[model samples]
Target: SGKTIADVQKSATQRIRISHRWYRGRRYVDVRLVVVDRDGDFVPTRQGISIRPELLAQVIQGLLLASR
Candidate 1:
């Protein structure tokens, strides 16, 4: 919650959220999608994946390299 990234707009009622989270004593990078539910509240959808802390930098590097 504290380390979560800002919400990025995805669509008319959807968003993308990149967050650093903890689960079962392990740290993770949560790359997830959220959507506005019927009640107008954001709810997590099943359209994303997470990575362990170790693989976090690997993806960062991939993005960094892909940027050029």
Candidate 2:
């Protein structure tokens, strides 16, 4: 899908990273995905291809499996 200038701009400002963790394992500690808006706002509130976490999860899983 094509993105508008505003959308692109907002999306560009977004960032996803695996930050800190306490326990050492696959299911432990604070493993989270943090998102920020274009104005450096920390909230998962955006509309577009990236905002849909549920659908994106499936798509990402496919990508990862396919990549393997």
Candidate 3:
């Protein structure tokens, strides 16, 4: 069986936003974030301070370790 074009469009419209956020003085974290498109592409969004890859990996690693 084959799905119709509408099925493909349904999947294409799905998008995800990934951000690490915390609030102290103001709303931050989303200052740097990534948007995942339906095709699984990462589009970086820097609404404020730009995120460096090295620092991003470090924070993600810390979060993963803390969860364990």
Best by TM-score: 1
Candidate 2: how many backbone clashes?
0
Ranking by lDDT: 1, 3, 2
lDDT of 3 at 50: 29
Give each prediction's root-mean-square deviation over alpha carbons: 2.1, 11.5, 13.9
Q: Candidate 3 residues 1-68, lDDT tens each? A: 11111211113433234344444434233433345556777454443352344476777788799994
Error of 2 at 61 (Å): 11
Poorly placed runs, candidate 2 (over 4 Å)? 1-11, 23-31, 37-64
The whole-model lDDT of each prediction reads: 0.85, 0.39, 0.43
How many angstroms is residue 25 displaced in model 3 relative to the true structure, after the best TM-score fit?
Answer: 27
**Residues 1-68, model 1: lDDT tens digits:** 52777689989899998888888888788889999999999888889888998888899899999995
Q: Among these predicted structures, which one has the highest lDDT?
A: 1
TM-score of candidate 3 on Cα atoms, chains taken together: 0.27
The alpha-carbon lDDT assigned to residue 23 of candidate 1 equals 86
